[PDB]
């Protein structure tokens, strides 16, 4: 539940927000898509598996850990987005295609985006494009991300959480600086006004020989969480990997149905064939000989046209789309 | 090379004073800061006190020491010193001169370089 | 202020690995620091910041630190390794004391 500094904000420019995304990935071949954020799905504040509520960073100097459901939660590329899943920093969504992945928060009015750049363009399996899976058609072998949650397609190490500095913390008066820690809460203060001094201040208290805030620095001593190896946050020293936890979503084997194109129609010439072809979407027709040299031609075709192939002695073959393929031999 | 040789101990009488030397060579004494830490014998090691860099401001000392052992520094010939006052039995042991390097974030020290040490004995 | 606690030995044959601990109320939070010694040597110190090391020490050494344990551990013990271990850490909220271990011999 850290803060990433996330490149576009609900308004135009950069900020820090729990709602980072920090990669995207597209392979599935329904078109799902795996997006990682730093806020924990399916959580509540002491972590427990919860799939109704969440947890992520607070906009606040003691910056706890704060909570909302899922029904405000909302992804978009370039319409809505439909969530269809959701465990940890990880989400899995279907998306129309898009140039860029947004995923907002809507705390009422508090309408928190974040937007980061990636091309998902519609992408199919088999030999025809087309918009939909068929209601009919070949059940061809094809690999998605499977929507069982408790699955995994690898490990993400954490470490522990690094510095989070403040001057909330800190207070200039007089030209003086003084720490000022939440109740009950020992914070670890550092500073350098010439002397490098360091300690642990839990309640409000002076330092001497000090004139401006810039020069210390203040923040609590929290080891009771892990922190994703991000680029936006400045590490702990002890950076050993601390904890693995698994990438669920794993992009398992299936199969799916492909469409079945029009049947060529077949008008035969000395030595050689005419097929009339119709495929109102983009389909592949590949052929090649059966001699010494294949010379093997492929060709995406749309609307209705006619195709003059000889054919000699040896023979020769093709498919059509998603076809089976079809070979012949002339006399 | 880095070496750090200490001088000035020896026999002294419970209540006396000593002014331990400790002069550095190899790096930029300026730039570290220095502490004197204690092994009696048949015990373990125990830090005594630490001045700053690089004008040791702020010095720091354990707690039956305070008011009467002191650490200084000096820059120029790049020597580090622990007088004691009011000494007594249990001060009998083994002092290293330490050098200390310390990390900010996290706030980290730890000493590097030691000297082979020099004995003081109190002692009616 | 934070006490160490280590067990007074450890009785290790060559060859084997050899585990070395450091016990204190929340030392996991803090950065632990093993230092070796062969009496009337000086000490040296093998390990700094609870998973790293000095130039030259082997690769038989390695630290970690958990919870309320510190741990040193030493692959493939040989003669050589048959020392005195004292674990350090700095409580900077108790006036910047230095506290180190009862000892361990190996």
């Known amino acids: 539940p850290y803060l990433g500094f996330c490149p576009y904000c609900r308004h135009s420019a950069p900020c820090f927000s729990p709602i980072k995304i920090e990669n995207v990935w597209d392979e599935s071949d329904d078109g799902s898509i795996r997006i990682q954020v730093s806020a924990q799905f399916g959580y509540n504040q002491a972590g427990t598996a919860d799939v109704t509520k969440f947890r992520y960073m607070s906009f606040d100097h003691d910056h706890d850990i704060k909570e909302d459901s899922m029904d405000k939660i909302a992804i978009s590329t370039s319409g809505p987005c439909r969530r269809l899943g959701h465990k940890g920093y990880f989400l899995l969504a279907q998306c129309p295609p898009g140039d860029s992945v947004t995923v907002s928060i809507t705390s009422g009015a508090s309408e928190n985006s974040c937007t980061v750049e990636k091309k998902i363009r519609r992408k199919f399996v088999g030999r025809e494009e087309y918009l939909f899976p068929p209601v009919h058609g070949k059940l061809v072998k094809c690999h998605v991300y499977d929507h069982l949650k408790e699955t995994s397609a690898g490990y993400i190490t954490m470490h522990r959480p690094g510095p989070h500095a403040y001057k909330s913390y800190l207070e200039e008066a007089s030209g003086e600086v003084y720490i000022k820690p939440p109740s009950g809460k020992n914070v670890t203060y550092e500073c350098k006004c010439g002397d490098y001094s360091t300690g642990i201040v839990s309640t409000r208290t002076k330092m001497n020989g000090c004139t401006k805030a810039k020069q210390c620095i203040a923040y609590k001593s929290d080891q009771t969480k892990w922190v994703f190896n991000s680029p936006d946050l400045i590490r702990h020293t002890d950076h050993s990997v601390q904890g693995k936890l698994h990438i669920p979503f794993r992009l398992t084997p299936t199969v799916c149905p492909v469409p079945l194109a029009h049947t060529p129609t077949v008008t035969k010439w000395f030595k050689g064939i005419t097929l009339h072809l119709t495929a109102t979407r983009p389909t592949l027709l590949t052929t090649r000989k059966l001699g010494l040299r294949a010379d093997a031609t492929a060709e995406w075709i749309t609307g209705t046209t006619s195709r003059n192939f000889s054919v000699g002695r040896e023979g020769l073959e093709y498919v059509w789309g998603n076809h089976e393929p079809v070979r012949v031999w002339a006399q | 090379e880095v070496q750090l040789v200490e001088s000035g101990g020896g026999l002294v009488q419970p209540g006396g004073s000593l002014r331990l030397s400790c002069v550095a060579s190899?790096?930029?004494?300026?730039?570290?800061?220095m502490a004197w830490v204690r092994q009696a014998t048949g015990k373990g090691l125990e830090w005594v006190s630490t001045i700053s860099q690089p004008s040791g401001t702020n010095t720091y000392y354990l707690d039956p020491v305070k008011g009467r052992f002191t650490v200084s520094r000096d820059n120029a010939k790049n020597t580090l010193y622990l007088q004691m006052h009011s000494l007594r039995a249990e001060d009998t042991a083994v002092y290293y001169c330490?050098?200390?390097?310390?990390?900010?974030?996290?706030?980290?020290?730890?000493?590097?370089?030691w000297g082979p040490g020099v004995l003081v004995t109190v002692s009616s | 202020s934070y006490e160490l606690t280590q067990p007074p030995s450890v009785s290790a044959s060559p060859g084997q690995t050899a585990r070395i601990t450091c016990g204190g109320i929340n030392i996991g939070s803090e950065l632990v620091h093993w230092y070796q010694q062969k009496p009337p040597q000086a000490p040296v110190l093998v390990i700094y910041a609870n998973g790293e090391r000095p130039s030259g020490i082997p690769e038989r050494f390695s630290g970690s630190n958990s919870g309320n344990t510190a741990t040193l551990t030493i692959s493939g013990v040989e003669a050589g390794d048959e020392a005195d271990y004292y674990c350090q850490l700095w409580d900077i909220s108790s006036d910047h004391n230095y506290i180190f271990g009862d000892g361990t011999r190996l």
């Open positions: 190899g790096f930029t004494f300026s730039d570290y800061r």
């Open positions: 330490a050098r200390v390097v310390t990390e900010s974030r996290p706030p980290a020290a730890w000493f590097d370089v």
